[PDB]
Amino acid sequence: EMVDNLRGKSGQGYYVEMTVGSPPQTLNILVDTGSSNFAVGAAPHPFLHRYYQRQLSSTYRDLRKGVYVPYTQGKWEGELGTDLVSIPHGPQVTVRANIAAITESDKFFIQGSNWEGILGLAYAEIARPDDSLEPFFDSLVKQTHVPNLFSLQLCGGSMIIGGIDHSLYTGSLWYTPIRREWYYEVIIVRVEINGQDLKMDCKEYNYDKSIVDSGTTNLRLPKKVFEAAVKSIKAASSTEKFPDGFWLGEQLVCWQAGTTPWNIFPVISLYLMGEVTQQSFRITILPQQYLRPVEDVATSQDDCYKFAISQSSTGTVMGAVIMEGFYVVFDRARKRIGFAVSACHVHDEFRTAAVEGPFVTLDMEDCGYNIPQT
Numbered sequence: 001e002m003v004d005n006l007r008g009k010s011g012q013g014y015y016v017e018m019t020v021g022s023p024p025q026t027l028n029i030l031v032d033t034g035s036s037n038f039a040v041g042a043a044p045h046p047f048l049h050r051y052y053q054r055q056l057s058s059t060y061r062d063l064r065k066g067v068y069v070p071y072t073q074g075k076w077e078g079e080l081g082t083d084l085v086s087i088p089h090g091p092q093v094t095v096r097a098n099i100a101a102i103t104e105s106d107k108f109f110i111q112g113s114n115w116e117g118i119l120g121l122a123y124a125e126i127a128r129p130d131d132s133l134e135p136f137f138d139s140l141v142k143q144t145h146v147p148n149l150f151s152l153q154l155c156g157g158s159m160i161i162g163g164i165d166h167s168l169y170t171g172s173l174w175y176t177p178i179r180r181e182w183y184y185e186v187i188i189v190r191v192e193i194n195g196q197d198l199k200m201d202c203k204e205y206n207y208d209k210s211i212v213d214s215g216t217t218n219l220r221l222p223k224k225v226f227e228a229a230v231k232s233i234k235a236a237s238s239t240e241k242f243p244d245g246f247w248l249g250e251q252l253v254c255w256q257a258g259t260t261p262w263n264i265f266p267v268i269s270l271y272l273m274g275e276v277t278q279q280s281f282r283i284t285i286l287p288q289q290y291l292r293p294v295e296d297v298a299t300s301q302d303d304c305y306k307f308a309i310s311q312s313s314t315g316t317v318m319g320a321v322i323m324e325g326f327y328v329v330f331d332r333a334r335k336r337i338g339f340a341v342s343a344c345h346v347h348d349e350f351r352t353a354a355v356e357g358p359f360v361t362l363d364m365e366d367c368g369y370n371i372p373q374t
């Protein structure tokens with residue numbers, strides 16, 4: 001009953017149905033593993049079809065404190081409070097949770113996204129105002145018997161709370177350690193394009209950090225890694241020349257409907273640290289993931305795409321376009337992230353997204369940018 005409980009797309013986010021308040025107010029809530037605040041629109045907004053009305057809830061408690069939350073894209077401010085929350089197509093339970101009632105926002109809500117709030121699924125360490133504001137999933141685990149784990153299959157898609165659904169993946173689950181519990185931080189040990197090593201000190205791949213983030217669209221890469229990746233992808237696809245603006249994500253590339261030359265674009269392999277010393281596994285990303293379709297009836301004689309790899313000064317972000325086609329297990333209980341090939345991964349009759357291992361590295365350097373436990 002939890003299968004197919006997500007809707008949405010990489011560009012505007014994936015959301016799940018929730019209720020807040022007594023009596024229950026149903027709202028669509030974006031699932032975001034890249035933040036830790038539960039917040040809902042709570043005042044009229046041009047892009048909102050509905051919003052949380054605290055005056056209709058007898059169980060609302062005002063915490064008499066404001067909160068401001070900035071993201072890479074968008075920001076909002078609101079009033080902190082608590083109320084009863086349920087997930088109709090998740091575990092059948094009710095918990096009292098912190099909720100930020102958004103009263104002001106800028107470039108946060110997305111027109112036509114069909115969601116009205118956001119569910120930050122990361123750890124308290126990064127919650128605003130501070131780590132004393134318990135995140136929703138922490139409250140869920142504390143107040144119910146739900147196992148301390150959830151999994152995401154982004155396609156629609158599924159969020160499985162408290163469990164792993166075998167019907168959602170094929171092959172083996174490979175686990176990489178959560179390096180630190182704030183974001184879902186992981187360690188990349190190697191990057192290949194077209195099978196060719198980028199040949200950097202592996203700490204570069206994780207400067208300042210690397211995270212798994214369902215709330216960000218793109219694969220975002222540290223400047224140095226991004227520039228190396230673009231040069232390698234350019235070289236692989238050199239039979240066609242694109243304007244520099246495409247590579248900057250500032251303009252579309254279009255082909256006649258159905259003629260997209262997938263074969264000229266390379267596969268990208270990200271090797272993630274394994275659970276055992278000097279072992280790793282890789283997840284492989286097809287161009288169907290990193291060239292993101294942009295729907296627009298005006299351009300619809302063509303298929304058009306944005307380049308969904310982009311530069312970051314805040315570390316690697318493995319966003320939705322990476323997570324799509326994988327089943328990703330956020331195993332908080334065992335401090336690890338699991339990857340397997342998704343039942344809904346898109347591909348062609350030549351190449352397939354993969355999760356595979358084990359691979360060994362002879363270089364013993366810690367690929368984490370920061371010294372652990374300091």
Ligand SMILES: CCNc1cc(C(=O)N[C@@H](Cc2ccccc2)[C@H](O)CNC2CCCCC2)cc(N2CCCC2=O)c1
Nearest residue numbers: 011012013034035071072073074108215216217218310314
């Ligand atoms: C789904 C909408 N598309 C996005 C969203 C975000 C973004 O900032 N997402 C937030 C959540 C959010 C969700 C929906 C609307 C606003 C915010 C996440 O917490 C960041 N997590 C952070 C990321 C970095 C700091 C640490 C964790 C960045 C995008 N960008 C920016 C350029 C490339 C790209 O894809 C595209």
